Amino acid sequence: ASNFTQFVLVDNGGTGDVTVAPSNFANGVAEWISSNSRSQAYKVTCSVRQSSAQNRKYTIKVEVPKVATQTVGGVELPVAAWRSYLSMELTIPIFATNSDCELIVKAMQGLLKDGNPIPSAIAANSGIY
Amino acid sequence: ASNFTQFVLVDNGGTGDVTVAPSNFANGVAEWISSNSRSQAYKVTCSVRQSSAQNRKYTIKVEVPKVATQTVGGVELPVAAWRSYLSMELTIPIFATNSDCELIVKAMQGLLKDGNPIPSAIAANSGIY
Amino acid sequence: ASNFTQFVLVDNGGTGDVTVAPSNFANGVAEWISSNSRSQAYKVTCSVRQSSAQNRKYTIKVEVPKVATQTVGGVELPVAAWRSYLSMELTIPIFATNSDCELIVKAMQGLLKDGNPIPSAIAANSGIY
Amino acid sequence: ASNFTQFVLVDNGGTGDVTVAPSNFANGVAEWISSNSRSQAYKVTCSVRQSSAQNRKYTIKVEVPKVATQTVGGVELPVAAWRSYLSMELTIPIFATNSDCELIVKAMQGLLKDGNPIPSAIAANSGIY
Amino acid sequence: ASNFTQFVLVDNGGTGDVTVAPSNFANGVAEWISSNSRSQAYKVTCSVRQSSAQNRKYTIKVEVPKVATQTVGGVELPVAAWRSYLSMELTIPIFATNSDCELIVKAMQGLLKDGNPIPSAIAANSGIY
Amino acid sequence: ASNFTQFVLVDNGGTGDVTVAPSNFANGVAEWISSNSRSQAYKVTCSVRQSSAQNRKYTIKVEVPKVATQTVGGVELPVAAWRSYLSMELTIPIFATNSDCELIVKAMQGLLKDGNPIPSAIAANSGIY
RNA sequence: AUGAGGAUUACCCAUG
RNA sequence: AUGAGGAUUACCCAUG
RNA sequence: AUGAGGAUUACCCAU
Numbered sequence A, B, C, D, E, F: 001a002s003n004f005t006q007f008v009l010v011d012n013g014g015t016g017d018v019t020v021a022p023s024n025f026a027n028g029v030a031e032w033i034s035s036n037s038r039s040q041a042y043k044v045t046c047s048v049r050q051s052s053a054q055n056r057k058y059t060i061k062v063e064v065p066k067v068a069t070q071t072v073g074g075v076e077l078p079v080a081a082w083r084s085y086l087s088m089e090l091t092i093p094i095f096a097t098n099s100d101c102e103l104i105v106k107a108m109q110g111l112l113k114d115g116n117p118i119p120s121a122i123a124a125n126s127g128i129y
Numbered sequence G, H: 001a002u003g004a005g006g007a008u009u010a011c012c013c014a015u016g
Numbered sequence I: 001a002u003g004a005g006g007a008u009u010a011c012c013c014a015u
Helices: A098-112 A117-122 B098-112 B117-123 C098-111 C117-122 D098-111 D117-122 E098-112 E117-123 F098-112 F117-122
Strands: A007-010 A018-024 A030-033 A043-049 A055-065 A083-093 B007-010 B018-024 B030-034 B043-049 B055-072 B075-093 C007-010 C018-024 C030-034 C043-046 C048-050 C055-072 C075-093 D007-010 D018-024 D030-034 D043-046 D048-050 D055-072 D075-093 E007-010 E018-024 E030-034 E043-049 E055-072 E075-093 F007-010 F018-024 F030-033 F043-049 F055-065 F083-093
Touching: A007 B098, A043 B117, A043 C018, A055 B098, A055 B117, A083 A098, A083 B098, A098 A117, A098 B007, A098 B055, A098 B075, A098 B098, A098 B117, A117 B043, A117 B098, B007 B030, B055 C075, B075 B098, B075 C075, B098 B117, C007 C030, C007 D098, C043 D117, C055 D098, C075 C098, C075 D098, C098 D007, C098 D055, C098 D075, C098 D117, C117 D043, C117 D098, D007 D030, D055 E075, D075 D098, D075 E075, E007 E030, E007 F098, E043 F117, E055 F098, E075 E098, E075 F098, E098 E117, E098 F007, E098 F055, E098 F083, E098 F098, E098 F117, E117 F043, E117 F055, E117 F098, F083 F098, F098 F117
Parallel strands: none
Antiparallel strands: A007 A018, A018 A030, A030 A043, A043 A055, A055 A083, A083 B075, B007 B018, B018 B030, B030 B043, B043 B055, B055 B075, C007 C018, C018 C030, C030 C043, C043 C055, C048 C055, C055 C075, C075 D075, D007 D018, D018 D030, D030 D043, D043 D055, D048 D055, D055 D075, E007 E018, E018 E030, E030 E043, E043 E055, E055 E075, E075 F083, F007 F018, F018 F030, F030 F043, F043 F055, F055 F083
16 A cells, blocks of 8 residues: 555535645654644654554544634744644554454544534533533 | 433444443443443443643543453353453643634544545554555 | 555465565564454564674564464464564675675575575475485 | 585576585585685575474575785785675474475565565665665 | 655766665664765765754754775775765744745755855855955 | 855845845854844854864854744744754865865755755655655 | 553553 | 764763 | 574573
8 A cells, every 4th residue: 555645634625624744754653744833733643563462552643723813823822722632542452353453443433423422522612411 | 412322333334333322420431331241342431621720631442342252161151352442532722612622523533534544554454654 | 765665575476465564663673564463464574773883784584474263262363373483684894885785685586596405495394405 | 306506696697697506514504605716705504403392493694795806915815805694594383384385485585576675775775764 | 745755965967966865764864875885875864853842853964975995904995085074953943834944944045055155165165254 | 255245045036035144253253144133133153163183164053033923023932932043063074175175065055955855844844754 | 741651441650 | 952062973072 | 793592583592
């Protein structure tokens, strides 16, 4: 294959889409970044290694900028007030076949599918109630 | 409303769908398990806490099992050959708007959409290259 | 440009073709793994480093697995009955030009060419005679 | 029958062809040396031995010389400016059938096939990238 | 894309051009070397790290050799009489826009443009006066 | 000669050009500064000294202002958020002739030439990938 | 609070 | 983190 | 750094 390619991170139906493209590959850690100042960019990083003798583990990180009242290209401090951080860690036993892995991916897609509890809770500054 | 409802975790087109439902909320940790014996069930847990003075942190966990029947002491028991674990932590500043949060959700959905680099790598037991 | 890509390790015409793809490149050690169960995958690693003042040293490593199913307690897992390990080390002085290196490669290819003493001895559970 | 014979180590079509011929086979170590000055000759050695109870272990060794003339005191001698050393060790379990071995050989040939990552990296004084 | 491609380092109008190509990416340090023996090659290395919490730092190195043939122990070896070293560090705030960065690049290009003070002084073995 | 003269640092094709002119010569350290408040100016400094008995060394420093959302003449804090710093250090052995030095300058120009990896990486808030 | 730190996964480890 | 600090250049030195 | 040293193969071992 060669999966390290540009892709659409935020899909707003063609118009207003946020595309993130490869920007670094130091130490096997792939990185995609949107076209912004590094302080306001959407950032995605991913890597895999065999955590133990029994498992392999993907470490996926995502950074999403606060947009409401944002000043494009401006200096916005404190940084912690303007950014959200996602840190995923997927552990998969070495016995998992391609099929097993496809199932795992589907489970992840379903977890975040539109309308389901988790995503709708997050999207509303809410918890479970 | 209420968002603590059941949802289909693994969608196999209506037939063979892994649907998970509410099962516990003790200690502020919402739990969903698939309709199986506790030993072979799929598990999803979620919780939100106001970590910093200015951050809210979601902690989500998903467990995908590889169901199997094991003969222990000459008796067959429903068990799991192994489990795949997804542990994710999402940190959102309190200044995030609902619109700002929807953006985070959309990013996560685009991250795992079919065909995009990351889910592709995972499903093929490979890294990004 | 990039040479850290997917390639054919075993060529069985166009069918049994064993392909190994990049998986990780941490600490100057490149790693390729064939698809499906990590437990039954082929592995190839490589690294170069300045061993002494005048020498650079390559460390190639290959693993050929014997695919098999392991049944225990009635639970079967994809495993490798055993593995064949290849560990080679190539030392090349810094005075070697690209031409000198091409020659070294030809020597390695010739060593293992079909019909020659060494490869044919190995292929037949034999030694030299 | 005999596989301890002369063979082509470097194939330069039908001209620069480096041929190496048997020279000695003492203590289970077969040795091939190219013709002319031992000082500027190519060397190849090989041996097999039962490393452990279930493993047999091959130890192949190759030397590629950089032909040069050494003048000292007005006396010139055929020497090797330097040498490139290849030291490989192949371990094969005793359960390996002739088929398993043929596969192992194909893996070795594939590893060094023209155009693939490793051989092409070596041939260019490069590493992986 | 990919930006890890070869490029002409020293342009002598198509004839005698010193072109350098990718050769290593181990440890997050991209390396390019000219098509020579490792001992006489031109070398270019680059790396980026997020130094401060709000800075990104590029570290670039270039090595220009003075090729020579040295007689060591009565044998001739390709070597470098000496080397000229360029070590540059560029610190860019994370708030820098792509446009802000293009400005940095243009400044560096204008800095070394033919006829301008600095490259003039360097090329004449003198200081600024 | 007398190279300490005003020159164009950022060339935007005649219109919008950034010219930097001599502004200080204390301690043999030449300084050029653009026509701005010292906090928002483009600054260039250069000096040469014999670092050791074998080498001479040029120390070139450049400072480039963040322009996006900049407020001309305003007080912008923190300073580290609004400025980029370039620190070049060129070491040249005392044996280098004028010609040798011209080569070194060309190498530097080629390193930063438009379209080449290093400059295009910087100009895109990127690394090598 | 961090960790391309580990897990048997609502637990354990290291450093602010 | 600095250094018109040094190098044999992906290494070493001094001070925040 | 070598070991026709061992390996659960980027570990372990004498010199």
